[PDB]
Design an enzyme around this catalytic site. Structure first.
Site, PDB file in Angstrom:
ATOM      1  N   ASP A 240      -8.645 -29.186 -34.110  1.00  0.00           N
ATOM      2  CA  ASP A 240      -7.509 -28.530 -34.729  1.00  0.00           C
ATOM      3  C   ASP A 240      -7.005 -29.476 -35.781  1.00  0.00           C
ATOM      4  O   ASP A 240      -5.990 -29.913 -35.353  1.00  0.00           O
ATOM      5  CB  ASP A 240      -6.751 -27.669 -33.862  1.00  0.00           C
ATOM      6  CG  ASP A 240      -5.655 -26.977 -34.633  1.00  0.00           C
ATOM      7  OD1 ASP A 240      -5.718 -27.024 -35.974  1.00  0.00           O
ATOM      8  OD2 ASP A 240      -4.411 -26.482 -34.084  1.00  0.00           O
TER       9      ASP A 240
ATOM     10  N   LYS B  17      -2.583 -31.545 -45.807  1.00  0.00           N
ATOM     11  CA  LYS B  17      -3.505 -30.225 -45.650  1.00  0.00           C
ATOM     12  C   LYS B  17      -2.929 -29.293 -46.926  1.00  0.00           C
ATOM     13  O   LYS B  17      -3.586 -28.495 -47.098  1.00  0.00           O
ATOM     14  CB  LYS B  17      -3.202 -29.527 -44.405  1.00  0.00           C
ATOM     15  CG  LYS B  17      -4.285 -28.501 -43.885  1.00  0.00           C
ATOM     16  CD  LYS B  17      -4.237 -27.881 -42.726  1.00  0.00           C
ATOM     17  CE  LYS B  17      -5.054 -26.890 -42.392  1.00  0.00           C
ATOM     18  NZ  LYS B  17      -4.865 -26.362 -40.880  1.00  0.00           N
TER      19      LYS B  17
ATOM     20  N   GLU C 206      -9.239 -20.572 -38.102  1.00  0.00           N
ATOM     21  CA  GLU C 206      -8.313 -20.685 -37.051  1.00  0.00           C
ATOM     22  C   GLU C 206      -8.160 -19.497 -36.235  1.00  0.00           C
ATOM     23  O   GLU C 206      -8.042 -19.549 -34.999  1.00  0.00           O
ATOM     24  CB  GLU C 206      -7.077 -21.353 -37.609  1.00  0.00           C
ATOM     25  CG  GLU C 206      -7.296 -22.761 -37.965  1.00  0.00           C
ATOM     26  CD  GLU C 206      -5.991 -23.419 -38.956  1.00  0.00           C
ATOM     27  OE1 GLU C 206      -5.403 -22.741 -39.401  1.00  0.00           O
ATOM     28  OE2 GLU C 206      -6.219 -24.746 -39.231  1.00  0.00           O
TER      29      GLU C 206
ATOM     30  N   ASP D 208      -1.327 -15.892 -37.274  1.00  0.00           N
ATOM     31  CA  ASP D 208      -0.911 -17.679 -37.169  1.00  0.00           C
ATOM     32  C   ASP D 208      -0.048 -18.002 -38.172  1.00  0.00           C
ATOM     33  O   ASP D 208      -0.535 -17.764 -39.395  1.00  0.00           O
ATOM     34  CB  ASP D 208      -2.512 -18.089 -37.194  1.00  0.00           C
ATOM     35  CG  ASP D 208      -2.516 -19.806 -36.865  1.00  0.00           C
ATOM     36  OD1 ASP D 208      -1.663 -20.397 -37.110  1.00  0.00           O
ATOM     37  OD2 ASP D 208      -3.365 -19.981 -36.440  1.00  0.00           O
TER      38      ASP D 208
HETATM   39  N1  LIG Z   1       9.984 -23.817 -31.094  1.00  0.00           N
HETATM   40  C1  LIG Z   1       9.780 -23.703 -32.540  1.00  0.00           C
HETATM   41  N2  LIG Z   1      10.773 -22.892 -33.145  1.00  0.00           N
HETATM   42  C2  LIG Z   1      10.603 -23.024 -34.210  1.00  0.00           C
HETATM   43  N3  LIG Z   1       9.875 -23.589 -35.236  1.00  0.00           N
HETATM   44  C3  LIG Z   1       8.921 -24.106 -34.296  1.00  0.00           C
HETATM   45  C4  LIG Z   1       8.930 -24.412 -32.992  1.00  0.00           C
HETATM   46  N4  LIG Z   1       7.923 -25.169 -32.751  1.00  0.00           N
HETATM   47  C5  LIG Z   1       7.200 -25.681 -33.857  1.00  0.00           C
HETATM   48  N5  LIG Z   1       7.750 -24.976 -35.045  1.00  0.00           N
HETATM   49  C6  LIG Z   1       7.294 -25.249 -36.286  1.00  0.00           C
HETATM   50  O1  LIG Z   1       5.964 -24.784 -36.320  1.00  0.00           O
HETATM   51  C7  LIG Z   1       5.243 -25.710 -37.577  1.00  0.00           C
HETATM   52  C8  LIG Z   1       4.083 -26.339 -36.261  1.00  0.00           C
HETATM   53  O2  LIG Z   1       3.159 -25.376 -36.012  1.00  0.00           O
HETATM   54  P1  LIG Z   1       1.670 -25.912 -35.797  1.00  0.00           P
HETATM   55  O3  LIG Z   1       1.783 -27.243 -35.104  1.00  0.00           O
HETATM   56  O4  LIG Z   1       0.950 -24.936 -35.245  1.00  0.00           O
HETATM   57  O5  LIG Z   1       1.141 -25.896 -37.291  1.00  0.00           O
HETATM   58  P2  LIG Z   1      -0.137 -26.623 -37.852  1.00  0.00           P
HETATM   59  O6  LIG Z   1      -1.254 -26.085 -36.959  1.00  0.00           O
HETATM   60  O7  LIG Z   1      -0.005 -28.238 -37.886  1.00  0.00           O
HETATM   61  O8  LIG Z   1       0.128 -25.699 -39.018  1.00  0.00           O
HETATM   62  P3  LIG Z   1      -0.962 -24.951 -39.778  1.00  0.00           P
HETATM   63  O9  LIG Z   1      -1.885 -24.631 -38.680  1.00  0.00           O
HETATM   64  O10 LIG Z   1      -0.485 -24.109 -40.725  1.00  0.00           O
HETATM   65  O11 LIG Z   1      -2.060 -26.042 -40.544  1.00  0.00           O
HETATM   66  C9  LIG Z   1       6.296 -26.708 -37.934  1.00  0.00           C
HETATM   67  O12 LIG Z   1       6.731 -26.478 -39.045  1.00  0.00           O
HETATM   68  C10 LIG Z   1       7.330 -26.666 -36.755  1.00  0.00           C
HETATM   69  O13 LIG Z   1       8.658 -27.178 -37.369  1.00  0.00           O
HETATM   70 MG   LIG Z   2      -2.151 -24.553 -36.979  1.00  0.00          MG
END
Ligand SMILES: Nc1ncnc2c1ncn2[C@@H]1O[C@H](COP(=O)(O)OP(=O)(O)OP(=O)(O)O)[C@@H](O)[C@H]1O
Ligand SMILES: [Mg+2]
Length: 601
Positions: A7, A69, A170, A193
């Site tokens: 991922d 990304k 995804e 998502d």
């Molecule tokens: N408990 C939470 N409450 C609010 N926001 C959160 C929480 N935990 C994570 N986030 C937010 O969610 C995002 C991270 O999500 P994730 O790791 O799934 O993103 P990612 O997979 O890297 O992004 P994408 O899939 O869009 O490319 C960040 O912006 C983070 O600040």
């Molecule tokens: Mg993601």
């Protein structure tokens, strides 16, 4: 070897493997089940990925890259890229072909290379865990990624030294992770998502007939530039406006302050998913003619909800669009599955639940389900997960530009992939040598309002009056969702060569060169690790020699004492530096001058 599922997220990345029929998420070197997608290039030639890059982001603002990304597969003049140019602490520049690259220490770097650094960290995590090389991987992309973004992610995988067996959407990976154990009830699900930079919604039917799971994607929609970064930007804008009001200083001009402010804004946003109120509390933010300054601002949950409600509604609209495309209604949704850390916000959950009139599932991990689904897809490819069929779709209508600049659709959006569409093109004027097909993706009726995949010139056409040749052009979309344009003579069947112009991406030469650059970067990283080990050895030698001098005390000759202490000081000074040979030479000299003392000990 094994096909690992990666991922590759905007904010965090996650690697999983298929241990038999059980998917397992592998902790990285730092002991974390997820790795920040942050890449730092130090002055000494070392490359930091993950937490080590995250820690030093404050002192290295122009050379710490994140949210790549949201630049990958994009043109420089794009509105989203143009807005991000003045926000990101690192320099965003235009490539020679107009693509959006970054500049680090005077070096132009394509987003695929930077993402390949994260992919290499995931690869190294998998190889450290398994104790064997890994060369095949499944890499995830947002369901709404266009052809350029998908191909760029695949190129990033190749540059990292990975054979990209599959590029999987995804939400589809989330559905695969969900469908492994649970129903198995011919369910219909809505995958919502919302990550750090991208948002997808997928309506997928999972029916199991005679032990044969079928995951058919009924519809998909979303926004590839909507995510937690935008929530953070809203919170940062509120914080800077209030601080400028109550202190009179514009904080956007201080890069270190902006870095710490972004980190604190994300921290407060995450805290407000459990607390009703929090404090953005940062001392030593900046300075003015008076001296040091401090920030202590109260932020309630209601204020954050007010700041991000319109973003939530922007995420709500693709739900309606996807439901219309799937020909279903809200009541037809058997399950609603939330993926992404940003869905942990109470407002997001409330809005989704009240839109669907149904509580989303609470047994789906929003941070790791995508990697698990990628691992499941890899196991399906290898055959270790039998009796599973996948019918994914393409999210954008594929078309060609025709008279007046009007889009003519050949493959409509939500068409099941892989798919083919053949169409015969011919001449329109006497003595033509080349015919150009402008291939684009999008739903708008005007070509200039869509995403250009490029001009395909069928050149070298035999002289003839208008309408004589019959050139069958075939447009293929593979399981990755990537376009392949081929040409053939209708009459004879002999292939027609195609030249691609005004397109986006990397050519083969650039990809091979970047693979070589990645290998050299790995060599430099190994040298940096060896330098760190040498510094550790030097610190050990310093401590041991000082202990022996201290325990010898008055028994040590004065001249030997002075020489040993001078050698200790020289070794300490070398250790504080960044020169391995100097450190080794100082260690050798210290061992030489203190040989008898250590032999006595
Ligand atoms: N408990 C939470 N409450 C609010 N926001 C959160 C929480 N935990 C994570 N986030 C937010 O969610 C995002 C991270 O999500 P994730 O790791 O799934 O993103 P990612 O997979 O890297 O992004 P994408 O899939 O869009 O490319 C960040 O912006 C983070 O600040
Ligand atoms: Mg993601």
């Amino acid at each position: 070897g094994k096909i690992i599922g990666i991922d590759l997220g905007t904010t965090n990345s996650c690697v999983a493997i298929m241990d038999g029929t059980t998917p397992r998420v592998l902790e990285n070197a730092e002991g974390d089940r997820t790795t920040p997608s942050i890449i730092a290039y130090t002055q000494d030639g070392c490359t930091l990925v993950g937490q080590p890059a995250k820690r030093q982001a404050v002192t290295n603002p122009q050379n710490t890259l994140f949210a790549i990304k949201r630049l990958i597969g994009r043109r420089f003049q794009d509105e989203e890229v143009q807005r991000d140019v003045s926000i990101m602490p690192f320099k965003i520049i235009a490539a020679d072909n107009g693509d959006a690259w970054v500049e680090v220490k005077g070096q132009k770097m394509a987003p695929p290379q930077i993402s390949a650094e994260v992919l290499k960290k995931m690869k190294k995590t998998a190889e450290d865990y398994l104790g064997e090389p890994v060369t095949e991987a499944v890499i995830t992309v947002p369901a709404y990624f266009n052809d350029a973004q998908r191909q760029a992610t695949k190129d990033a995988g190749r540059i990292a030294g990975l054979e990209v067996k599959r590029i999987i959407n995804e939400p589809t990976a989330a559905a695969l992770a969900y469908g492994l154990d649970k129903g198995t009830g011919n369910r219909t699900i809505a995958v919502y998502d919302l990550g750090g930079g991208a948002f997808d919604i997928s309506i997928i039917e999972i029916d199991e007939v005679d032990g044969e799971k079928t995951f058919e994607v009924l519809a998909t929609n979303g926004d590839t530039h909507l995510g937690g970064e935008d929530f953070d930007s809203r919170l940062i804008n509120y914080l800077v406006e209030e601080f400028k009001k109550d202190q009179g200083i514009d904080l956007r001009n201080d890069p270190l302050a902006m870095q710490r402010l972004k980190e604190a804004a994300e921290k407060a946003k995450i805290e407000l998913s459990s607390a009703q109120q929090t404090d953005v509390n940062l001392p030593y933010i900046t300075a003015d003619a008076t001296g040091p300054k401090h920030m202590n601002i109260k932020v309630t949950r209601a204020k954050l909800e007010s700041l991000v409600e319109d973003l939530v509604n922007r995420s709500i609209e693709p739900l309606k669009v996807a439901l219309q495309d799937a020909g279903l209604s809200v009541s037809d949704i058997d399950d609603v599955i939330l993926v992404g850390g940003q869905t942990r916000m109470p407002m997001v959950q409330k809005k989704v639940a009240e839109f669907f009139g149904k509580e989303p599932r609470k047994d789906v991990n929003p941070d790791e389900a995508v990697a698990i689904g990628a691992a499941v897809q890899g196991g399906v490819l290898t055959g270790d997960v039998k009796d599973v069929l996948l019918l994914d779709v393409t999210p954008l209508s594929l078309g060609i530009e025709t008279m007046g600049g009007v889009m003519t659709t050949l493959i409509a959006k939500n068409t099941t992939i892989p798919t083919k569409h053949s169409q015969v093109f011919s001449t329109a004027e006497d003595n033509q040598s080349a015919v150009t097909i402008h291939v684009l993706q999008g739903e708008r009726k005007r070509a200039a309002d869509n995403k250009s995949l490029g001009q395909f010139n069928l050149d070298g056409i035999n002289p003839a009056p208008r309408g004589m040749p019959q050139i069958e052009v075939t447009f293929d979309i593979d399981a990755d969702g990537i376009l392949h344009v081929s040409a053939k003579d209708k009459n004879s069947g002999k292939e027609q060569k195609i030249t691609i112009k005004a397109s986006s991406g990397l050519n083969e030469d650039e990809i091979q060169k970047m693979v070589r650059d990645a290998e050299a970067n790995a060599e430099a990283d190994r040298k940096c690790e060896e330098l760190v080990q040498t510094r550790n050895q030097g610190d050990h030698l310093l401590h041991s020699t000082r202990k022996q001098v201290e325990e010898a005390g008055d028994k040590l000759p004065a001249d030997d004492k002075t020489a040993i202490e001078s050698a200790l000081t020289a070794l300490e000074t070398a250790l504080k530096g960044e020169d391995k040979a100097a450190i080794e030479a100082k260690m050798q000299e210290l061992a030489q001058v203190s040989q008898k003392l250590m032999e006595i000990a």
